[PDB]
Enzyme design. Structure first.
Site, PDB file in Angstrom:
ATOM      1  CG  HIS A  81       6.720  39.666  10.482  1.00 36.81           C
ATOM      2  ND1 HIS A  81       5.567  39.305  11.133  1.00 36.81           N
ATOM      3  CD2 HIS A  81       7.736  39.562  11.370  1.00 36.81           C
ATOM      4  CE1 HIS A  81       5.886  38.981  12.408  1.00 36.81           C
ATOM      5  NE2 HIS A  81       7.187  39.194  12.573  1.00 36.81           N
ATOM      6  CB  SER A  93       8.111  37.676  15.360  1.00 39.26           C
ATOM      7  OG  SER A  93       7.279  38.765  15.157  1.00 39.26           O
ATOM      8  CG  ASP A 110       2.467  38.031  10.718  1.00 35.31           C
ATOM      9  OD1 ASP A 110       3.171  38.855  10.083  1.00 35.31           O
ATOM     10  OD2 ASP A 110       3.083  37.404  11.642  1.00 35.31           O
ATOM     11  CG  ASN A 121      11.160  41.386  19.864  1.00 35.22           C
ATOM     12  OD1 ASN A 121      11.186  40.160  20.084  1.00 35.22           O
ATOM     13  ND2 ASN A 121      10.846  41.857  18.665  1.00 35.22           N
TER      14      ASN A 121
END
Ligand code: CA
Ligand code: CA
Ligand code: CA
Ligand code: CA
Lengths: 275, 107, 107, 275
Positions: free
Chosen positions: A64, A221, A32, A155
Site C-alpha cells: 500500500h 487512499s 502508512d 471508502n
C-alpha cells in the site's frame, strides 16, 4: 520509457513541473505501511517505524505505502511513472503492519515523529470509524506546527444521508479527500458527508509496488497523495506560504463538481492553486 | 446439547459467487470450541458475547486500515443454539473485515 | 490448497426452517479429513467419488427401511474444491436419509 | 377403556368380529423391527431375529414393528386399541435393526423362516427401491407355499408418471398397499404406479408402542397391516380358501376410488370380501 498516470495530468501537475516546480526541498511524510526504498523509481530520504514488530520503515510488507509514495513522488526519469512532486524529499513513517492494521497510538506516534523532524506535508491514507482525543490533539498539533495534513476521506460509499467520513479525515484540521474517476465522476465507494474537502483521482491509479513493479489500485487512499503531492508543489513555488495559505489555495481553486456532500469543493487544480 | 456449527468463507468480490471462496473455515462452539479456525475459543467466545448475532460485532475504535478499495465477501452458514444462520457481508478491504469481530474474523 | 468445508444439519420437517436443526456436523476434506463427523474419512471419500456432487449419491440396493412417513430435512452448506455448495433434500424418514450416502449421511 | 382406531372401522372389521370372526387360529408373521411382547394389549406367540447384532425378536428398539403388530392384532379387552384380527397368533420375525435398517438377506431369511413355520399371512412394512433375484424368489416361494403376502407400497409420493412403488411391493406375487386418510383421500406421500393393488388407512393410525404406550403414525407402513389383518379374518371364516382366493376376494370387493394409478382397485372392505 516513463508513463504519466492520468491522475497526475488531471490535476494539472505537468503544467507546474514545466515551469520548474517539482516539489524540490519539500519534506513529505507518507504515514502508512512503509516504502520500498529499493524501488528504482523512488528515492526515500529517511523515515521510522512505530510498528513494534516491524521496525524497518523501508520494508513495505503490504505494498500500500509503496503505491501511495509513488503517486506523491515517483521519480522523473525515463522509466516507470511520475509523481505529483517528483523531487519532494519522501519520508517513510511506518505505522501499519503487513496486514495493513495499525493501532491508534502507532498512528499518533507517527504524526508526532512527523512534527519533530520538521515535515511540511503529512499524507495519511488510513482511517477508522471512531475518533479519539489523543488522535485529534495530534492532528491539531501538526496543523499548529505548520504541517499540511491530508487524509483519505474513507471508502464507506454513501449511507442514507449520514456522514461516511472516517478519522482522521473527519477532523476540521485535516484536508479530507474523496475519489473521482478520469471522468470527474465520484467513485461509488467514496465516503460522503459535510466533512469532505476536495476530490482527486482515486480509480485505477498506476503507481509503484515493492519488487521493482507497477500496478493500479482503487481507493480514497490513491486520491490522498495527489493532494499531498499538490501541496508540495505549491510550497516549492512559494516556500513561505503557510499551511493555511496552501490549504486555502487548494480549496478555493477547485473545479466544482456536484453538491458538496458528495464532492466537497470539487476537483483540485494545482496549476490554479499555485497562481 | 447445543446444535452449533458454522462455516466461514472469504474471497475478493461483492456477492456470494461472482466471489469465489478463497479461504474457508469451520467452527464449533458446542460443546467445546473446535474446527479449523486459528482462533476457535475466541470466535466462539465472540458469538456468545453477542449471542451468535452477526450484525452486532462492533468494529475497532482502536485500529486504522488502509483506504484501498478491494472488497472482500464474507459468508457464515450454519446453526447457533439450534437456530439457522446464513449471513453475508462485503467489507471494503480485508483489514476492515478483520477489525470487525475481534476473532470470528481472526481469519 | 483445497477450499473445502461443509456443515450438515438434520431435523424433522419438509423445509429449511419450519424444520429446526436437531443435529449439525462439520466436515473438512482438505487437506485431510476432519470435523465433527462420526465418519469424516469416508464422507470425504464419498464426495471425492462423486466429485462433491450432492444429487448423485446412490441410495441402497441393499437396505430396507420402514415405510413410516416421518420426513427429515438435510442441509449441506459450504465449498468443495472452492465451489460453493448449498444443498437441501427431504427424505421420507431418517433410514432413507442414511441409506443414501454410504457415509456423508453416516449421521 | 378400549378405543377402536378409525382404520379398523373404515375397512369393516367390526362387522366380522360381531359374527364371531376375529382371526382365531391364524398365524401372521410381522416381518419388521421386533414386537414388544411385554405390551399389555398384545399377545405375541413366538418369532425369531435375522438381525445378527439384535437377536431377541421380542425387543423392539425402533417401535415401528410394535405399532404394526397392534394394527394387525391389538387384543380385544377393555384397554388400549383393537386390531383387525384380535385373536390372530402373532409372530415377531425381526429383520430390521434399532435404526430401522435391514439388509436384503435379513429380509429374505425372515420370509424363509416364515415359510418353514407355516405362517398363513406375512406382513412386510419395509421397502427399498431396487429389487433382487433372491428377493423375488423368496416372495414367490412364499406365495407358492400358500402364504398371503402383503407389503407397503412405499412413501415416494408421485413422480411425473413413473412408478414410485418399491420392493417387495412391486412384485406381482405381493399385495401392495397404498394409504388413504379417513376421507378415502390418497395420502400425498403414498407411492403410485401400476403395481399398487389396494388402499388402506395410513394417516395418523393409533396403535401400540413399546413401554405400555399408544400413539399415531403415518405411512404406507400403517396401511399394510390392515390388509394383513383383513386376510387373517377371511381365513378365520374360511380356513381352507387358498391365498389366491383370499387375495381375489380382497381385490374384487374393494370400494373403487380414483384412477388405479393412484388407488389400485381402491379401499378394501373385509365384510364384503368375507361374503
Ligand atoms: Ca519515473
Ligand atoms: Ca475535514
Ligand atoms: Ca385392546
Ligand atoms: Ca404388486
Amino acid at each position: 520509457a516513463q508513463s504519466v498516470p492520468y491522475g497526475v495530468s488531471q490535476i494539472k501537475a505537468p503544467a507546474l513541473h514545466s515551469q520548474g516546480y517539482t516539489g524540490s526541498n519539500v519534506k513529505v511524510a507518507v504515514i502508512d505501511s512503509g516504502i520500498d526504498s529499493s524501488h528504482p523509481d523512488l528515492k526515500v530520504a529517511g523515515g521510522a517505524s512505530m510498528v513494534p514488530s516491524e521496525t524497518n520503515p523501508f520494508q513495505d510488507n503490504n505494498s500500500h505505502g509503496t503505491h501511495v509514495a509513488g503517486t506523491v513522488a515517483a521519480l522523473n526519469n525515463s522509466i516507470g511513472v511520475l509523481g505529483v512532486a517528483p523531487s519532494a524529499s519522501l519520508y517513510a513513517v511506518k505505522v501499519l503492519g503487513a496486514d495493513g492494521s495499525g493501532q491508534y497510538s502507532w498512528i499518533i506516534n507517527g504524526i508526532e515523529w512527523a512534527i519533530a523532524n520538521n515535515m511540511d506535508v503529512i499524507n495519511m491514507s488510513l482511517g477508522g470509524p471512531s475518533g479519539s482525543a489523543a488522535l485529534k490533539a495530534a492532528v491539531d498539533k501538526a496543523v499548529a506546527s505548520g504541517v499540511v495534513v491530508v487524509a483519505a476521506a474513507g471508502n464507506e460509499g454513501t449511507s442514507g444521508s449520514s456522514s461516511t467520513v472516517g478519522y482522521p479525515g473527519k477532523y476540521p484540521s485535516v484536508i479530507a479527500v474523496g475519489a473521482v474517476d478520469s471522468s470527474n465522476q465520484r467513485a461509488s465507494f467514496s465516503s460522503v458527508g459535510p466533512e469532505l474537502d476536495v476530490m482527486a483521482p482515486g480509480v485505477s491509479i498506476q503507481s509503484t509496488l515493492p519488487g521493482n513493479k507497477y500496478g493500479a489500485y482503487n481507493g480514497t487512499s490513491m486520491a490522498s497523495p495527489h493532494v499531498a503531492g499538490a501541496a508540495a508543489l505549491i510550497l516549492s513555488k512559494h516556500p513561505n506560504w503557510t499551511n493555511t495559505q496552501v490549504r486555502s489555495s487548494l480549496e478555493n481553486t477547485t473545479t466544482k463538481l456536484g453538491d458538496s456532500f458528495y464532492y466537497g469543493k470539487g476537483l483540485i487544480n494545482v496549476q490554479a492553486a499555485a497562481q | 446439547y447445543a446444535p452449533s456449527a458454522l462455516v466461514l468463507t472469504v474471497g475478493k468480490g461483492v456477492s456470494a459467487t461472482t466471489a469465489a471462496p478463497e479461504r474457508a473455515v469451520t467452527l464449533t462452539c458446542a460443546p467445546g470450541p473446535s474446527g479449523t479456525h486459528p482462533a476457535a475459543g475466541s470466535a466462539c467466545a465472540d458469538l456468545a458475547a453477542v449471542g451468535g448475532d452477526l450484525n452486532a460485532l462492533t468494529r475497532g475504535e482502536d485500529v486504522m486500515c488502509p483506504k484501498v478499495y478491494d472488497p472482500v465477501l464474507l459468508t457464515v452458514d450454519g446453526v447457533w443454539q439450534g437456530k439457522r444462520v446464513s449471513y453475508e457481508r462485503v467489507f471494503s478491504n480485508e483489514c476492515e473485515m478483520n477489525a470487525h469481530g475481534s476473532s470470528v474474523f481472526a481469519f
